[PDB]
Design a protein around this ligand. Structure first.
Ligand SMILES: Nc1ccn([C@H]2C[C@H](O)[C@@H](COP(=O)(O)OP(=O)(O)OP(=O)(O)O)O2)c(=O)n1
Ligand SMILES: [Cl-]
Ligand SMILES: [Cl-]
Ligand SMILES: [Cl-]
Ligand SMILES: [Mg+2]
Ligand SMILES: [Mg+2]
Ligand code: NA
Ligand code: NA
Length: 326
DNA sequence: CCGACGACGCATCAGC
DNA sequence: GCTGATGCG
DNA sequence: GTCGG
């Protein structure tokens, strides 16, 4: 990767601001600069060259100059030395521990993996599962395994009701050679924006995937969103596969294209696109694109029959999923 | 200078 | 119990 | 932290 040293430094700065400083706009600003530098097709030679890119300003250009000249950033060398920041940064790597809980735990003297294991009684359900699979959740998923997982989910949903449609989204749909988790978009004709003609539509799918021992744990579960844990079956005498994170989102069937646009991401791509929509006078969520009125209040949903229709409303050329990895 | 920075589901808690 | 705010994702 | 107006 052409500018990997720079984008790694900006990512570490972003994480510092989110986890330690609890400065979410600085977190998003460093992420935006790292994203625009990541796609820049030249090896950056100066901070001035980088400042030409949108989202890189004076402060980050100065940090890039320091990094290019020395290979390091003093500000980060200090943060890495700092016990409190280091402990907080670590604890947020556990799923369900965010910046607030991480600082609370560090305040109570809970600062290592050992400390967490000893104090399991102070964790909520999600954090408990995140700790149990801390090691597994740090591993990437090879695309070959993503394909096996897709084949299980799609076949088990079909067994519940052949009218379900399950689509694997996220980085998988963008063509990534490895993924951090599996994201599944689910639809069923009995659930539309107009009516819900069947209860338990997500529940029945979750139950079936549990019955065949694919889903192993639940982090959170409502009528439309499931967050949990899953695992591929292994063969005789084979080492078990790592446990993996799985997210399932049931979307109204008539709102599939807004839903698949949202669930394909990337998250930075959606933020860029939704910000552009606002500049163009629309608001986009996972259900609808609506116009903004003279006062800025959302109007009625606009008709959408393809992902491209949403790009057309905001005057963007269509971008295939593989070109949305921002 | 200075306001705005994407949009939302589920879990948890405070206050009533 | 319900409603609203906050955390986390 | 950055940017548009
Ligand atoms: N704050 C966020 C977080 C995520 N998503 C989205 C964009 C996605 O593509 C997606 C699926 O979520 P993931 O967190 O699982 O991210 P990815 O699938 O894109 O990458 P990976 O899971 O490989 O890390 O959620 C979004 O719009 N806003
Ligand atoms: Cl901030
Ligand atoms: Cl460094
Ligand atoms: Cl809506
Ligand atoms: Mg994903
Ligand atoms: Mg996910
Ligand atoms: Na710039
Ligand atoms: Na976390």
């Amino acid at each position: 990767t052409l500018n990997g040293g720079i984008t790694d430094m900006l990512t570490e700065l972003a994480n510092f601001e989110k986890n330690v400083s609890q400065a979410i706009h600085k977190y998003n600003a460093y992420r935006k600069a790292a994203s625009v530098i990541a796609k820049y097709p030249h090896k950056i030679k100066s901070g001035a060259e980088a400042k030409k890119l949108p989202g890189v300003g004076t402060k980050i250009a100065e940090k890039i100059d320091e990094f290019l000249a020395t290979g390091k950033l003093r500000k980060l060398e200090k943060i890495r030395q700092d016990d409190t920041s280091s402990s907080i940064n670590f604890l947020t790597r556990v799923s369900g521990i965010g910046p607030s809980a991480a600082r609370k735990f560090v305040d109570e003297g809970i600062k290592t993996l050992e400390d967490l294991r000893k104090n399991e009684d102070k964790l909520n359900h999600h954090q408990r599962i995140g700790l149990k699979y801390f090691g597994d959740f740090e591993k990437r998923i090879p695309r070959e395994e993503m394909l096996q997982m897709q084949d299980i989910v799609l076949n088990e949903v079909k067994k519940v009701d052949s009218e379900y449609i399950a689509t694997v989204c996220g980085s998988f749909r963008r063509g990534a050679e490895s993924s951090g988790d599996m994201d599944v978009l689910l639809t069923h004709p009995s659930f539309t924006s107009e009516s819900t003609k069947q209860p338990k539509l997500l529940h029945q799918v979750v139950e079936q995937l549990q019955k065949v021992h694919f889903i192993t744990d639940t982090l959170s579960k409502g009528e439309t969103k499931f967050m949990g844990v899953c695992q591929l079956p292994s063969k005789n005498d084979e080492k078990e596969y790592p446990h993996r994170r799985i997210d399932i989102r049931l979307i109204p069937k008539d709102q599939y294209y807004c839903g698949v646009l949202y669930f394909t991401g990337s998250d930075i791509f959606n933020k860029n696109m939704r910000a552009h929509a606002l500049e163009k006078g629309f608001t986009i969520n996972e259900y609808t694109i609506r116009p903004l009125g003279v006062t800025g209040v959302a109007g009625e949903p606009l008709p959408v029959d393809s992902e491209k229709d949403i790009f057309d409303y905001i005057q963007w050329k269509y971008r295939e999923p593989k070109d949305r990895s921002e």
